[PDB]
Amino acid sequence: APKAKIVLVGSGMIGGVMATLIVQKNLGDVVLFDIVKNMPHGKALDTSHTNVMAYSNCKVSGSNTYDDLAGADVVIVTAGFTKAPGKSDKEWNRDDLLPLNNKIMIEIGGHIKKNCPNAFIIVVTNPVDVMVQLLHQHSGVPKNKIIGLGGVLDTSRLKYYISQKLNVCPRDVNAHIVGAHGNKMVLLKRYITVGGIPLQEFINNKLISDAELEAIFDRTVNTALEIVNLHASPYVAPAAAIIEMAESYLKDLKKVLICSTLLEGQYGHSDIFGGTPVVLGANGVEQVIELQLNSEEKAKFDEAIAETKRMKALA
Amino acid sequence: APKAKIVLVGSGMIGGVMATLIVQKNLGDVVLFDIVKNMPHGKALDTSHTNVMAYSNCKVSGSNTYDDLAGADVVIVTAGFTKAPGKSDKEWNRDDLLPLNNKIMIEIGGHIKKNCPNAFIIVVTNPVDVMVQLLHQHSGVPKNKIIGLGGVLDTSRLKYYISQKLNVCPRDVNAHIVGAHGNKMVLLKRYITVGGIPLQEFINNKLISDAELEAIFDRTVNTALEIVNLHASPYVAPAAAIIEMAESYLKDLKKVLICSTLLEGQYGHSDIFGGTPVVLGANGVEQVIELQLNSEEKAKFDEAIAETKRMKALA
Amino acid sequence: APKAKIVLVGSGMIGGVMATLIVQKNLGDVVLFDIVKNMPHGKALDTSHTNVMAYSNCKVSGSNTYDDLAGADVVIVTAGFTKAPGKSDKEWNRDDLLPLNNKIMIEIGGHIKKNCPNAFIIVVTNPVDVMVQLLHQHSGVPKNKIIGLGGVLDTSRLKYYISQKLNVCPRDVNAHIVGAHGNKMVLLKRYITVGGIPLQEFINNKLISDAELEAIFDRTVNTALEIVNLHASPYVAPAAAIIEMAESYLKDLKKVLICSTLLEGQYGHSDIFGGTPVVLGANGVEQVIELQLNSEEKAKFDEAIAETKRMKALA
Amino acid sequence: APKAKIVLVGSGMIGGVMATLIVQKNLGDVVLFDIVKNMPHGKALDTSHTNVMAYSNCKVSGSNTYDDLAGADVVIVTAGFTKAPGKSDKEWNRDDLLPLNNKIMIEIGGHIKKNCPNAFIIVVTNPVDVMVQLLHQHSGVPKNKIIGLGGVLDTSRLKYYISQKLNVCPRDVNAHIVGAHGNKMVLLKRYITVGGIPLQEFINNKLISDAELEAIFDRTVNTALEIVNLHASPYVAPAAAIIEMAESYLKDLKKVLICSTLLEGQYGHSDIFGGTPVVLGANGVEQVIELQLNSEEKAKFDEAIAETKRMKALA
Ligand SMILES: NC(=O)c1ccc[n+]([C@@H]2O[C@H](COP(=O)([O-])OP(=O)(O)OC[C@H]3O[C@@H](n4cnc5c(N)ncnc54)[C@H](O)[C@@H]3O)[C@@H](O)[C@H]2O)c1
Ligand SMILES: NC(=O)c1ccc[n+]([C@@H]2O[C@H](COP(=O)([O-])OP(=O)(O)OC[C@H]3O[C@@H](n4cnc5c(N)ncnc54)[C@H](O)[C@@H]3O)[C@@H](O)[C@H]2O)c1
Ligand SMILES: NC(=O)c1ccc[n+]([C@@H]2O[C@H](COP(=O)([O-])OP(=O)(O)OC[C@H]3O[C@@H](n4cnc5c(N)ncnc54)[C@H](O)[C@@H]3O)[C@@H](O)[C@H]2O)c1
Ligand SMILES: NC(=O)c1ccc[n+]([C@@H]2O[C@H](COP(=O)([O-])OP(=O)(O)OC[C@H]3O[C@@H](n4cnc5c(N)ncnc54)[C@H](O)[C@@H]3O)[C@@H](O)[C@H]2O)c1
Ligand SMILES: O=C([O-])C(=O)[O-]
Ligand SMILES: O=C([O-])C(=O)[O-]
Ligand SMILES: O=C([O-])C(=O)[O-]
Ligand SMILES: O=C([O-])C(=O)[O-]
C-alpha cells in the first residue's frame, strides 16, 4: 500500500535465499539484479511460483539493468566475490576479497545515488565493514539509511551453539558480538544471557563450563571458514539475518540488531563503520546503542576496528 | 499427526480468546467446556468458522460433559470466578476468589485424574499459585506436567511498558517477575535487559530513570486492578500468555517462560508452588531454573511465597 | 513505514477480537474508539501487552474522541446495536436494528468526512447493506474506498460446513453467497467447488447429497440466529472476516473476497450496495466482479436487493 | 511432541531449500542426507543458525549414513541427476534421467524398507511418475504412504501466470494438471477457476482470451525447460511445493493437492502411478479424488500415462 520494492543487487547464493524468504514473508516486490545474463531471470521465474504455495503476492523479476534501482525502497548489496583466485579453502580469509570487491561497491554506489538516493541500504559484500563505508561514501545516503550485515549473523551462531548445550529455544539465548565481522570479531562473554538470565548463573550451576564456552567462541569465529571448507561461503543464515534486518525496517519493528554502522565517537571511534547494537525501524537506524564496555573489552573492540582501518587504507 | 486435543475447562472470557488463538495458530482441536448450558456451543460454532479465514483445520466443539476430557493432550483450567460478591472494583483482590474457586479445582482435579491423567495441565484460575497446587494434589499428575499462569503475563506488562519508553520492539525487553502472581509479585530490577543489554546502561544514559522504572513497577503490579476498574478482569493478554506456554509444550520449543511450578528446595522453599523461569518442551517442565537471587531479592521472594502459604492454609 | 493506523469505530465484541488479531498479525497501530467511557481504554491496555507474546509492535489505545480518526488509513465501523429492545432471541432479525443504527452511521460519516476522507472504510453495523450505503453517502468517500462485511463471513460458514462432511481443509471449499447479508442471502449452488472441482462431482459420487447440501444451506442462512440463541450476536468469525478484508487492502494481496459494494449496473442494479466478489488491494476495491448468473439465480439476487431497498426507504 | 524427524534423501538444490523452509516453518528436525562427503554437513550447519532468526527449534544435521533413516517420520527423496551427460540445455528432457536415476531409487527403497517402513514418503527424482512407483515397489510401503511431486508444482505455474494477467492474488486461481509430470501433462481448461468462479466468465468478459490461455498453457508445460536454459533445473518452487505436501501430512490439514499416486481403476488405469488430486492428512493419502473427465480429457490423460508406462518398461 503501495508494496515495498526490494532490489537485490547481486543474485547469487545469498540473493537467491533472500528472494525465497521475501516471498515467504510477503515483504514486497523483488528485483534479482546481477551482471550475469539469464541467471537472475531464471531464479526470479522459479521463485515467483512460490507465491501460490505461500499465499503471497510479490512480483519477482530478474534484471541486468542498473536503472531498475529506480523506485527501490530497500537495496541489499551482495554483489561480489566470496573467494580470491589461487587461495585454497583452508586459507580462506575475508580480507582477500578487498581488491576484488572494492570497485564493485564504488560502481553500485554511483547507481544508488542516481536512481534511489532515499532507499534504505544493507551492505553484505565482504569485507563488510570496509565495503559498507565505501558504499556510504559513493552513494551519498544519510548515515541512518545504510548498515552492514555482521552481528545478527555472528550472534546467531553463538546463540545457537549455546542453546544446543543448554537445551533451550535458540532465540532465548542473547549475545553480543561487536567491532567487525571478521577474525577479530569481539565476543562479549559478559553480555550473554539465557532467558534473560546472566550466562554466569548457568556456568555456576555447571550446566556449561568456561572451557566449553571458550570452544564455542572459537567455533563461532571460525564458523564461516568451517562451512567454506565443508561446502561453500555461507548463504542460508546470512540471507535470514539480512531479511530479519530488512523486515525490522519495513515493518517498523524497532528490533535491536547488531549491524555495522557509522561511528561518531562511540567506543572512542569516529569516521569508520563498526558493529554495534542499533534499533531498526521506519526511520532506518533510529538509535545507535553504545555498550558500556570495560577497558579490556574496549581494547578488543579497538583491535577489530584497527583491521577495518588497515583495509580501508588499502582500498 | 494425530492432532493434539486441547480441552479448555472454562469457556468464559479467557477461554474464548484461547480458542480463537488456537485456531489462528492451527495448534489442535479444541473443546470449550463449561458448566453453563448453550454458551460454549455458541462460542465454538462462531470460532469454528475462522478455520476458513485462518487456513487452519482445528475442530472446535462446546461441551457440558466432563468425560470429554478423555483423550486430552493439554488441559487449560480457567474455570471459576473473577470477582467476589459484594466487593467493589476498587477493592478487587485475587485473594478474595479463594473460597469461590477452591472447590472447583478439587472437582476438576478428580475428572482429570479419571479421564486424562497423562495430559499437560495449565492452571489459570485465581489465586493461581494456590489453585495450581490444589489441582496438582487432586489430579495426581506428575510435577513436570502441571504449571500455573503468572510470570509470562506479569512480565509481558513490564516488558511492554519499558519498551514504550525506550522505543524498542516489546519482546526485545526481557524481565523476571517471580514468587507469586499477586500483589507481592517480585519485580527483579537486576534481571531486566533491553536487547540483551543490562537496563542499567540505559539508566546511566538517562534514557529511562530509576524513578520512571519505579512507576512502571507499580503500574505492572496494579495492571489487573487498573483493567478491572476500566473494564473487566483481564483476558486477552492472559489468553495469549497461556497459548505461548501451551505452544512451547506442543511444539517442543523449549522456551524459557516464568510459570508457577512445584518448588523442591529452590529459593529455600519446598512443598509449595511458586513463579520461576522454567523450560517448557515435549516433556512438560523440562527444567526448573533457579535464579541466583541475592539475600534482599530472596526476602522479597519469601514474602510472595508467604501469601500463597497463608491462603493454602485457608483453603 | 510508516505503520498503518487502524481506527475501530466501535470497541464492543467484534472490536475486541479485531484488535487482538491486528496485534497477532502486526498489521498496524490500533485505536479502539467507543462512546462508552473507560471500557475501550481497558481493552486497549489488555490487548497492548500481547505485543510481547506476538513479537509485534502495534500501539493499541482507547478513545472517546472522534478527532482520533485523523490520520486513519483504515476505519472499521462496528458501532451500534446487535439486538432491538423487547425482542426475544428467537425473533432476532437484523432488520430490527435499522432504527437503532441508522443515526449512528450518519454521525460517524460526518466525522470520517472531516477527519479522514482518504481512509479505506469497512462497515459492519447491521443491517449492513443498508448501513454501508448510508455511511458512503454521509462520509463522501469514493466508491472504491468503502465496503460492507457480508460474503466473506457467510461463505466461511458454508465452506466450513461442507468441509466437515467431506473431510477436507476448510479453505479448500470455495463458495459464493451474494446479494445481501440477511435472510435472503443468495447461496449459489452452482458456484461451489472443492479443491477447485465442481461440488457436483462429489454429489455424483454420493460423498455429499443434494438433501445434505439443502440442510447446510439452511444452517448457513440461520447461523447468526443459531449463535444468538446459544450465546450472543456472533463476533469471532465476523472479526476474522473483517481482518482478512483489511489485510488484503493493507498488504495489496488482491484477494477475491465477497463484500457489499456500490452496484452501477451489475446484475441489473444501480444506486444500491450489494454483495458480490470484489478484488481488494492497495487501491481499495480494484475490481467489482459480476457473476454471470442465470435467470433463476438473478431472480434470487433481485429478492435480496429488494430487502435492502425496502429498508433504505425506511431509513 | 515428539518433534517429527524429516530425512531429506538428497541434499542438493531442492534439499537445501527444503531444509531452509522446514526451519522457517518449525516443522521438525531435519537430516540432510547425501552421498557427497562434507557438503550436507556444511549446508546443515549454515541452515541450523536460522533457528535464531526464525524463532524455531529444529535440529539440522548432515549425513552420509543410510541408517540415519531410522526414526524418520517423513522421507523426501530428491536423490539423483537433473541432466544427462552429453545433452545440451536446449534438448533437456526428464525422460533422459531414467537410466541415471532408476538404480538410485531401488537402493533408497531397500534402505527405507529396513529402517523406516512406517514413514510417509515423497518422491521427487525425475522422471517422477516412474521413479515413485519404482520406490513404492522396493520400499514396500503402503499405497497411502507414498506420493510423487508433480501437480502442486505444475499448477503453481499455471495459477501464477493466470493471476498475473488478471491482477488477483495468485492462490485465488485454482487449476488442475493431471496424468504425468512431463511434456504430456494434462492442463484441464475446464477445471480453472478464479476466486471460485469459472475462468470462462473472465474469458467471456475479455479479461483474458482463449489465445492468451493457450500461450500460458504452453509456457506452463515448458517452464522447467525455460528455467534450465536460463539457469538450472528448478529448485525453489519444487521445494515449496514439496513442503506444502509434507506440511499437510504433518499437521493433518487435509488439503487437496495434486500428486502422483497409485491408480487402482481411476480414469481406467491400474498398476501405475499418475497425477490426480488427493487429500493429504495424518493418515497419508486419505482420499484419491478422481476427476469426472470427459472423453476428450480422458484421451489426454491416457497419453500422459502411456509415457509413464513406456519408461517403466525401459526401467
Ligand atoms: N557480511 C556478512 O556477514 C557476509 C556473510 C556471508 C557472505 N558475505 C559476502 O556476501 C557476498 C555475496 O555472497 P554470495 O554467497 O551471495 O556470493 P555469490 O558469488 O553467490 O553471489 C555474488 C553475485 O554478485 C554478482 N555480481 C558481481 N558484480 C556485480 C555487480 N556489479 N552488480 C550486481 N551483481 C554483481 C555475481 O555475478 C554473483 O552472482 C560475498 O562478498 C560474501 O563474501 C557477507
Ligand atoms: N493466573 C493468571 O495470570 C490470571 C489472569 C487473569 C485471570 N485469571 C483468572 O482466570 C479465571 C478465569 O477468568 P475469565 O476472565 O475467563 O473468567 P470468566 O468468568 O469469564 O470465565 C470463567 C468460566 O468458568 C466457568 N466455570 C465455573 N465453574 C466451572 C466448572 N466447574 N467447570 C468448567 N467451567 C466452570 C464459568 O461458567 C465461566 O464461564 C478467573 O479465576 C480469573 O481470576 C488468572
Ligand atoms: N455485517 C456482518 O456480517 C455482521 C456480523 C456480525 C455482527 N454485525 C453487526 O456489527 C455490529 C457490532 O456487533 P458487536 O458484536 O461488536 O456489538 P457490540 O454491542 O458488542 O459493540 C458495539 C459497540 O458500538 C458502540 N457504539 C454505539 N454507538 C457508537 C458510536 N457512535 N461510536 C462508536 N461506538 C459506538 C457500543 O457502545 C458498543 O461497544 C452490530 O450492529 C452487529 O449486528 C455485522
Ligand atoms: N517431480 C518434480 O516436480 C521435480 C521438479 C524439479 C526437479 N525434480 C528432480 O529432483 C531431483 C533433484 O533435483 P535437484 O535440483 O535437487 O538436484 P541436485 O543435483 O542439486 O541434487 C541431487 C542430489 O542427489 C544426490 N544423490 C545422488 N545419489 C544419491 C543417493 N544414493 N542418496 C542420496 N543422495 C544422492 C547428489 O549427490 C545431489 O546432491 C532431480 O532428479 C530433478 O530432475 C523433480
Ligand atoms: O562472512 C561470511 O562469509 C560469514 O560469516 O558467513
Ligand atoms: O490475575 C489477573 O487477573 C491478571 O493479572 O490479569
Ligand atoms: O450479521 C451477523 O450477526 C452475522 O451473520 O454474524
Ligand atoms: O521437473 C522439473 O524439473 C520441474 O518441473 O521443475
> CB contact, 8 Å: A1 with chain C?
yes
Identity of the residue numbered C299:
A
Instruction: Judge whether A298 and A267 are in contact, CB under 8 Å.
Output: yes
> CB contact, 8 Å: B279 with chain A?
yes
Q: How many CB atoms lie within 10 A of CB A252?
A: 21
Instruction: Judge whether C111 and C10 are in contact, CB under 8 Å.
Output: no
For residue D120, what are the β-bridge partners? D74
Instruction: Say how far apart CA C17 and CA B20 lie, in whole Å.
Output: 9
- What are the grid coordinates assigned to C25, written together? 498479525
- What are the grid coordinates assigned to B293, written together? 537471587
Q: Cβ neighbours of residue A108 under 8 Å, at least 6 residues apart? A: A9, A77, A79, A135, A138, A139
- What are the grid coordinates assigned to C121, written together? 472504510
Instruction: Judge whether A206 and A212 are in contact, CB under 8 Å.
Output: no
Q: Tell me the residue length of chain C.
A: 315
Instruction: Say how far apart CA B162 and CA B199 lie, in whole Å.
Output: 10
Instruction: Say how far apart CA B15 and CA B116 lie, in whole Å.
Output: 19
> Do strands D270-281 and D284-288 pair parallel, antiparallel, or not at all (unpaired)?
antiparallel
Of C43, C55, C227, the CB nearest to B45: C227
Q: How many CB atoms lie within 10 A of CB D2?
A: 12
> Pick from A184, A182, A187, A183: which is nearest to A126 by CA?
A182
How many whole angstroms from D228 Cα to the centroid of ligand 8?
A: 9
Please work out whether the CB of residue D63 comes within 6 Å of at least one atom of ligand 8: no
- What are the grid coordinates assigned to D223, written together? 517452464
Chain B residue numbers with beta carbons less than 8 Å from the beta carbon of C231 are 38-39, 41-43, 46
Identity of the residue numbered B107:
E
Class of residue C219 by CB neighbours under 10 A (exposed 0-12, middle 13-18, buried 19+): middle
> CB contact, 8 Å: B265 with chain A?
no
Instruction: Judge whether B40 and B11 are in contact, CB under 8 Å.
Output: yes
Instruction: Judge whether B176 and B188 are in contact, CB under 8 Å.
Output: yes
Identity of the residue numbered B174:
N
> Pick from C214, C174, C186: which is nearest to C297 by CA?
C186
Of A3, A252, A254, the CB nearest to C252: A3
Say how many Å lie between the first and final Cα of chain B, rounded.
41
For residue A39, what are the β-bridge partners? none
- What are the grid coordinates assigned to A237, written together? 543464515
CB-facing half-sphere around the CA of B100: CA atoms within 13 A: 17
Please work out whether the CB of residue A150 comes within 6 Å of at least one atom of ligand 1: yes
Helix (H) / strand (E) element for D314: namely helix D295-314
Experimental method: X-ray
CA angle B5, B9, B14 (to 5 degrees): 100
Helix (H) / strand (E) element for C286: namely strand C284-288
Identity of the residue numbered B258:
I
Instruction: Say how far apart CA B58 and CA D102 lie, in whole Å.
Output: 41
> Do strands D193-194 and D186-187 pair parallel, antiparallel, or not at all (unpaired)?
unpaired
* Strands (DSSP E) found in D196-254: 197-198
Question: Could you check whether the bond before residue B127 is cis, i.e. omega within 30 degrees of 0?
Answer: yes
> CB contact, 8 Å: C258 with chain B?
no
How many whole angstroms from C125 Cα to the centroid of ligand 3?
A: 6
Q: Cβ neighbours of residue B261 under 8 Å, at least 6 residues apart? A: B143, B147, B148, B273, B274, B275, B276, B278, B285, B288
SS3 D286: strand
> CB contact, 8 Å: D285 with chain C?
no
How many whole angstroms from C94 Cα to the centroid of ligand 6?
A: 36
> CB contact, 8 Å: C165 with chain B?
no
Instruction: Judge whether D150 and D260 are in contact, CB under 8 Å.
Output: yes
SS3 D123: strand
Of A20, A223, A235, the CB nearest to D236: A20
SS3 C194: strand
Of D57, D249, D251, the CB nearest to B26: D251
- What are the grid coordinates assigned to D157, written together? 505455474
- What are the grid coordinates assigned to D44, written together? 546443515
Please work out whether the CB of residue A10 comes within 6 Å of at least one atom of ligand 1: yes
Identity of the residue numbered D282:
A
> Do strands A29-33 and A5-9 pair parallel, antiparallel, or not at all (unpaired)?
parallel
Domain boundaries, chain B: 1-148, 149-315
- Torsions phi, psi for A45 (to 5 deg): -65, -50
CB contact under 8 A, D196 and C204: no
- Domain D149-315: which topology? L-2-Hydroxyisocaproate Dehydrogenase; Chain A, domain 2 (3.90.110)
Please work out whether the CB of residue C235 comes within 6 Å of at least one atom of ligand 3: yes
Which of A53, A169, A255 is the mutation pick for testing B, counting most B CBs within 10 A? A169
Q: Tell me the residue length of chain B.
A: 315
- What are the grid coordinates assigned to B22, written together? 488456537
Please work out whether the CB of residue A238 comes within 6 Å of at least one atom of ligand 5: yes
CB contact under 8 A, A256 and B55: no
Instruction: Say how far apart CA D300 and CA A247 lie, in whole Å.
Output: 46
CA angle D161, D166, D168 (to 5 degrees): 90
- Please tell me whether C227 is known to bind a ligand: no
What is the DSSP-derived secondary structure letter of residue D291? -
> CB contact, 8 Å: B4 with chain C?
no
What is the DSSP-derived secondary structure letter of residue B2? P
Please report all neighbours of A, defined by 3+ CB atom pairs within 8 A.
B, C, D
Chain B residue numbers with beta carbons less than 8 Å from the beta carbon of A281 are 167
> Pick from A160, A172, A149: which is nearest to A241 by CA?
A149
Q: Cβ neighbours of residue B285 under 8 Å, at least 6 residues apart? A: B143, B144, B145, B147, B259, B261, B278, B279
Instruction: Say how far apart CA B150 and CA B153 lie, in whole Å.
Output: 6
- In the sheet where C60-63 sits, what is the strand order? C60-63, C29-33, C5-9, C74-77, C120-123, C146-148, C255-264, C270-281, C284-288
Q: Which ligand is nearest to the CA of B158?
A: 6
Report the chain B residue with the minimal C-alpha distance to residue A257: B195
Q: How far is CA B121 from CA B272, D62, D262, in A?
A: 17, 37, 43
Class of residue C20 by CB neighbours under 10 A (exposed 0-12, middle 13-18, buried 19+): buried
CA angle D308, D312, D315 (to 5 degrees): 140
Instruction: Say how far apart CA D177 and CA B243 lie, in whole Å.
Output: 40
> Pick from A267, A258, A277: which is nearest to A306 by CA?
A267
Query: Known catalytic residue: D231?
Result: no
> Pick from C47, D236, D182: which is nearest to B234 by CA?
C47
Instruction: Say how far apart CA B209 and CA B203 lie, in whole Å.
Output: 5
- Torsions phi, psi for C36 (to 5 deg): -75, 130
Instruction: Say how far apart CA D215 and CA D183 lie, in whole Å.
Output: 15
Q: Whose CA is nearest to atom 2 of ligand 7?
A: C224
- What are the grid coordinates assigned to A209, written together? 563450563
Annotated binding site of B for NAD(+): 13-149
Instruction: Say how far apart CA C195 and CA C211 lie, in whole Å.
Output: 21
How many whole angstroms from A149 Cα to the centroid of ligand 1?
A: 12
- Torsions phi, psi for B9 (to 5 deg): -85, 95
Identity of the residue numbered B19:
A
B210-221 and B223-230 are packed helices; what angle lies between their axes, rounded to 10 degrees? 60
CB contact under 8 A, D51 and A170: yes
- String of DSSP letters for chain A: -PPPEEEEE--SHHHHHHHHHHHHTT--EEEEE-SSSSHHHHHHHHHHTHHHHHT----EEEE--GGGGTT-SEEEE--S-SS-TT--STT--GGGGHHHHHHHHHHHHHHHHHH-TTSEEEE-SSSHHHHHHHHHHHH---GGGEEE--HHHHHHHHHHHHHHHHTS-GGGEE--EEB-SSTT-EE-GGG-EETTEEHHHHHHTTSS-HHHHHHHHHHHHTHHHHHHHHTSS--HHHHHHHHHHHHHHHTT--EEEEEEEEEESGGG-EEEEEEEEEEEETTEEEEE------HHHHHHHHHHHHHHHHHHHH-
- What are the grid coordinates assigned to C227, written together? 449463535
Q: How far is CA C169 from CA B36, C223, C241, D251, in A?
A: 31, 20, 17, 11
- In the sheet where D193-194 sits, what is the strand order? D173-174, D193-194, D197-198
Instruction: Say how far apart CA B230 and CA C37 lie, in whole Å.
Output: 8
> Pick from B230, B161, B224: which is nearest to C64 by CA?
B230
Instruction: Say how far apart CA B71 and CA B68 lie, in whole Å.
Output: 8
> CB contact, 8 Å: A230 with chain D?
yes
Say how many Å lie between the first and final Cα of chain A, rounded.
41
Please work out whether the CB of residue B27 comes within 6 Å of at least one atom of ligand 2: no
> CB contact, 8 Å: D168 with chain C?
yes
Instruction: Say how far apart CA B171 and CA B159 lie, in whole Å.
Output: 7
Instruction: Say how far apart CA C200 and CA C210 lie, in whole Å.
Output: 9
Annotated binding site of D for NAD(+): 13-149
Instruction: Say how far apart CA A98 and CA A311 lie, in whole Å.
Output: 7
What is the DSSP-derived secondary structure letter of residue D179? B
Please work out whether the CB of residue B34 comes within 6 Å of at least one atom of ligand 2: yes
Q: Which atom of ligand 4 is nearest to the CA of D33?
A: 33
> Do strands D270-281 and C193-194 pair parallel, antiparallel, or not at all (unpaired)?
unpaired
Report the chain B residue with the minimal C-alpha distance to residue A258: B195
- What are the grid coordinates assigned to C284, written together? 481499495
- String of DSSP letters for B115-172: H-TTSEEEE-SSSHHHHHHHHHHHH---GGGEEE--HHHHHHHHHHHHHHHHTS-GGG
Instruction: Say how far apart CA D21 and CA D246 lie, in whole Å.
Output: 11
Class of residue B96 by CB neighbours under 10 A (exposed 0-12, middle 13-18, buried 19+): middle
Breaks (C-N over 2.5 A) in chain D follow: none
What is the DSSP-derived secondary structure letter of residue C31? E
SS3 C54: helix
How many whole angstroms from C300 Cα to the centroid of ligand 2?
A: 46
Breaks (C-N over 2.5 A) in chain C follow: none
Instruction: Say how far apart CA D146 and CA D132 lie, in whole Å.
Output: 8
> Pick from C65, C63, C61: which is nearest to C111 by CA?
C65
What is the DSSP-derived secondary structure letter of residue D258? E
Instruction: Say how far apart CA B108 and CA B105 lie, in whole Å.
Output: 5
Helix (H) / strand (E) element for D62: namely strand D60-63
Helix (H) / strand (E) element for D215: namely helix D210-221
The CA-based diameter of chain C, rounded to the nearest angstrom, is 59
Q: Which atom of ligand 5 is nearest to the CA of A228?
A: 3
Q: How many CB atoms lie within 10 A of CB C67?
A: 10
Instruction: Say how far apart CA C210 and CA B293 lie, in whole Å.
Output: 69
Active site members of A? 181
Alpha helix stretches (DSSP H) within chain B: 13-24, 39-48, 50-54, 98-115, 128-139, 151-166, 199-204, 210-221, 223-230, 236-250, 295-314
Q: Which atom of ligand 4 is nearest to the CA of D15?
A: 16
Of D57, D73, D252, the CB nearest to B2: D252
- In the sheet where B193-194 sits, what is the strand order? B173-174, B193-194, B197-198
- What are the grid coordinates assigned to A69, written together? 534501482
Helix (H) / strand (E) element for B187: namely strand B186-187
Q: Cβ neighbours of residue D278 under 8 Å, at least 6 residues apart? A: D147, D256, D257, D258, D259, D261, D285, D286, D287, D288, D289
Q: How far is CA C281 from CA A1, C23, C44, D80, in A?
A: 8, 21, 28, 43
Q: Cβ neighbours of residue A294 under 8 Å, at least 6 residues apart? A: A190
Q: How many CB atoms lie within 10 A of CB D124?
A: 27
SS3 D28: coil
Q: Cβ neighbours of residue C292 under 8 Å, at least 6 residues apart? A: D201, D204
In CATH terms, D1-148 corresponds, of 3.40.50.1000, 3.50.50.100, 3.40.50.720, 3.30.70.20, to 3.40.50.720
Helix (H) / strand (E) element for C136: namely helix C128-139
- String of DSSP letters for D260-283: EEEEESGGG-EEEEEEEEEEEETT
Instruction: Say how far apart CA C1 and CA A252 lie, in whole Å.
Output: 6
Please report all neighbours of B, defined by 3+ CB atom pairs within 8 A.
A, C, D
Q: Tell me the residue length of chain A.
A: 315
Q: Which atom of ligand 2 is nearest to the CA of B234?
A: 6
Annotated binding site of B for substrate: 94, 157, 181
CB contact under 8 A, C168 and D256: yes
- Could you give the dihedral angle defined by the CA atoms of residues A194, A197, A200 and A205, in that order, rounded to the nearest 10 degrees? -80
Please work out whether the CB of residue A107 comes within 6 Å of at least one atom of ligand 1: yes
Q: Which atom of ligand 7 is nearest to the CA of C154?
A: 5
How many whole angstroms from B297 Cα to the centroid of ligand 7?
A: 53
Say how many Å lie between the first and final Cα of chain C, rounded.
41
> Pick from C1, C12, C30, C52: which is nearest to C233 by CA?
C12
Instruction: Say how far apart CA C171 and CA C192 lie, in whole Å.
Output: 12
Q: Cβ neighbours of residue C223 under 8 Å, at least 6 residues apart? A: B45, B49, C157, C234
How many whole angstroms from D234 Cα to the centroid of ligand 8?
A: 6
CA angle C263, C269, C274 (to 5 degrees): 50
Q: Cβ neighbours of residue A222 under 8 Å, at least 6 residues apart? A: none
Instruction: Say how far apart CA B54 and CA C26 lie, in whole Å.
Output: 15
Task: Tell me how close the Cα of D184 comes to any Cα of chain C, in angstroms.
Answer: 21
For residue D270, what are the β-bridge partners? D264
CB contact under 8 A, A57 and C251: yes
Say how many Å lie between the first and final Cα of chain D, rounded.
41
CB contact under 8 A, A232 and D153: no
